[PDB]
Amino acid sequence: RVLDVEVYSSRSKVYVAVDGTTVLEDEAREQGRGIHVIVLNQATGHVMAKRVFDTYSPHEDEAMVLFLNMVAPGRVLICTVKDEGSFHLKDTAKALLRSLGSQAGPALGWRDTWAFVGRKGGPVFGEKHSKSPALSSWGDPVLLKTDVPLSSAEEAECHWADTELNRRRRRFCSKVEGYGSVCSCKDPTPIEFSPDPLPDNKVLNVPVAVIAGNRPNYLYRMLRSLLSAQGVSPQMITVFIDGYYEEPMDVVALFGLRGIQHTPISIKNARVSQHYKASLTATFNLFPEAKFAVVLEEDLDIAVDFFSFLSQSIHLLEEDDSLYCISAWNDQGYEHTAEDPALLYRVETMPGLGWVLRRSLYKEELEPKWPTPEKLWDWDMWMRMPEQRRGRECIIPDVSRSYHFGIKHKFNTVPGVQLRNVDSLKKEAYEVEVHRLLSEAEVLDHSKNPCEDSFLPDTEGHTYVAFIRMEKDDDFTTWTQLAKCLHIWDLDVRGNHRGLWRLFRKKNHFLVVGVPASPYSVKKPPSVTPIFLEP
Incomplete structure (x- = not known):
């Protein structure tokens, strides 16, 4: 009326x-x-x-x-x-x-x-x-x-052809407003995607756990990119929402995905940590034969070759028990310090931000000791601690396959990149590869200032090595300051493997070694005195 x-x-x-x-x-x-x-x-x-x-x-x-x-x-x-x-x-x-x-x-x-x-x-x-x-x-x-x-x-409904994609659209568009072209009568935006398939996909039966809160606009943006990634299986995706907010779940429904709502047990970062524990247990219960799980946050853009990257590398996890995880994220991979979309690294951390969890690690090690809801601890800080990581490393790409938009990081857009030399990321093989990289690396002159371009010969394609002062395994004094002036990640130490950081400067690969602490101090010539920087 x-x-x-x-x-x-x-x-x-x-x-x-x-x-x-x-x-x-x-x-x-x-x-x-x-x-x-x-x-x-x-x-x-x-x-x-x-x-x-x-x-x-x-x-x-x-x-x-x-x-x-x-x-x-x-x-x-x-x-x-x-x-x-x-x-x-x-x-x-x-x-x-x-x-x-x-x-x-x-x-x-x-x-x-x-x-x-x-x-x-x-x-x-x-x-x-x-x-x-x-x-x-x-x-x-x-x-x-x-x-x-x-x-x-x-007169209030758009009249679309009764494809039942468009029924999902209408169910959404008659309830929620503010999403623009997804609800436009003429020229509606696709809510279904035809990403190119991925032949010989070893990630095919691996569940994707999407960790979500109450930011439906973020979720909408992430989901589109996930569902556009070569090799996605939408039915393997589960969106876990921490709370019973309707609009996040209407967004799930719009794409026709499985969504689980969860009563929050609070507070603060304890609430987030318990949502992660609830979601990972649910994921492995929903998929009892799954050996791994992909863990994604709603504030990431997923690279087009995300599952291609995972598929080529997943066998490292099943074949090398000194690996903790695979992550899509390179903390130090900025647009000026990342270059090769086919290169992989080993790093002594757990970067998160699009990562792969081994089932055995979770059910046998991490779930039984997960922090209780009373502890205001970050879940990811906790998994990086020694009694959780127990010395293991994570596989990361030089060019990240996720992008964090949760409010200059390098984000791969090239389709179907073949990764180079995957099996040399296994523990022993990577050491040989590190040695072989330094035996070929041109030592730089260390009387120069490392923070300025002149530190490397203006070239492209070369691999250079610098040595910095690292007295103990605890000692990141010079690295931290180096990180600042290279305008990279600086607040906590990331990117190190036994005292080696790997980067790019001006499209040259750029190794950094901390001596004498690193076992790679051997490849330093005695003529050279290690660099030192101080705040």
């Missing part, structure tokens, strides 16, 4: 009511400033999104404009100001509100109150406004009460 809509704009309180149900109320004293936005379905009046943009603060207006362009035309838009929404409201945002039929939106001023109910693409249903009389005053509070007539059930 007709919706009776109330929208209240005020210095200290904002609310919206639909047919007597208050679907928004905010009186918080330090939160909720700015332009609140509620989007209704124009045939039922259910809310499909709630937002608030603090346009008193810089750049929040751009986020508002963006969200609004992602709302399908036809939906009821509801705007109400709390306290102040004009100071950083730029002209682009004012222009869009004008385009939606608002007259007082585009002229909004300091501490004005403003309430608006309009359908995207006209007409407007109602508007109220109060101008502040003084810089130290607010506009009078303002209550807009208006009827919005409901659309037919048919």
Whole structure:
């Protein structure tokens, strides 16, 4: 029939009511400033999104404009100001509100109150406004009460061909708003992907555990890239959500994936750690014959050859018990220090960020001693500790096959890279390969300054070696400072194998050895005195 809509704009309180149900109320004293936005379905009046943009603060207006362009035309838009929404409201945002039929939106001023109910693409249903009389005053509070007539059930839905991909789309698009082209009537965005297959895929029956919280926009972005990776089996993917939030799971449903909701046992990083334990146990129970599990976080972009990389390297894990894991992530692999998308390293850490867990390691070693919910310990910090890692290493690529967007790291886009010399990553073979690399490496002059380009001969394709001061296995004094000035990862030590770091500078491979601590101190000529840097 007709919706009776109330929208209240005020210095200290904002609310919206639909047919007597208050679907928004905010009186918080330090939160909720700015332009609140509620989007209704124009045939039922259910809310499909709630937002608030603090346009008193810089750049929040751009986020508002963006969200609004992602709302399908036809939906009821509801705007109400709390306290102040004009100071950083730029002209682009004012222009869009004008385009939606608002007259007082585009002229909004300091501490004005403003309430608006309009359908995207006209007409407007109602508007109220109060101008502040003084810089130290607010506009009078303002209550807009208006009827919005409901659309037919048919005029509110896109009419797509009844492919039942499009049923999944419609189930999503009639509930959730703000996702843009995935719900556009003409030219909808694919929610199904045809990634090139992966011949002889040794990762085919390995479950993918997607670790998710309450950031459905992140999940949406990650899932698309995962499902675009050559070699994905969608039915092997399980999205584990820590909590019963609907919108993350509607996103799971949109792609037709399996999702598990989990009651959080809190708090802080203890809550995250217990979610990981719950998810890894569930993964191995859902797949009782699985020998490994891929662990992915919702804030990663998955490289197109992610499963190609895993498939070529997985046999290292089953064949070499001194390996802890395979990770897609190279902590030191920035765009200027990574180059070869086919090169692999061994590192004495556990990088996470797209990694492979051996079942036996989890069921036999890690699960029985997993930190109890009382410990505020990071799960990954805990697995890197000595009694968990027990000396083992992880396989990483020089060019990462994941990208962390969770808010300049090198991210591989080349399809189907054949990895070079995989079997020389086994424990003994890698040592031979390290020796063979240093016997061929051109020692640099160490009277130069390592932090500046002139330290390496302007060339490409060469492999160079430097030696730095490392008195004990604990002693990363020079390395840490070197890392800073090479503008690489610097905060904790990553990238070391028995006192060797491997990198690239100016497209030359660049070995670093800490002497005398490293067993590779042997390959240093006596003429050379190791470099030393200090804060």
